[PDB]
Design a binder for this molecule. Structure first.
Ligand code: HEM
Length: 110
């Protein structure tokens, strides 16, 4: 099966490399990027991200609910546009299908 866990790991590496300040909103704030895989808060977040991807593909994802939760953290369309680019890179590195359509679904509620 597609290794979404690896894709998500690359996604977070790209995301926080381009926008380090985004990492301050998470429970793994201040943690060195190359050590995130050993951080408990990160493992949980990454797992939830993998879950969301599988839910989007599976057809059970609640894009409206995810958008509202992100608004609840002062995360908006701009951040999601930035994320879209990082995820596109991360998918490509693993021969995985692109996920822009799923981010578009979220953006449609931001
Ligand atoms: C491809 C784009 C993204 C996806 C698929 C995604 C997915 C998720 C998921 C599944 C959760 C958990 C929600 C829950 O538990 O109900 C979450 C939480 C969160 N997301 Fe994202 N996200 C994305 C982009 C971003 C960006 C760009 C930011 C920028 C700051 C961000 C900030 C957060 C924060 C602060 C949380 C809560 C963390 C915590 O509870 O400690 N997200 N995200």
């Amino acid at each position: 099966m597609v290794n979404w866990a690896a894709v998500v790991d690359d996604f977070y590496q790209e995301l926080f490399k381009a926008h380090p300040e985004y990492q301050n909103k998470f429970g793994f704030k201040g943690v060195a990027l190359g050590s995130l895989k050993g951080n408990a808060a990160y493992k949980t977040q990454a797992g939830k991200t993998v879950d969301y991807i599988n839910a989007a593909i599976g057809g059970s994802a609640d894009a409206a609910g995810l958008a509202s939760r992100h608004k609840g953290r002062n995360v908006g369309s701009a951040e999601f546009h930035n994320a879209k680019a990082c995820l596109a890179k991360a998918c490509s590195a693993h021969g995985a299908p692109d996920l822009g359509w799923a981010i578009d679904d979220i953006l449609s509620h931001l």
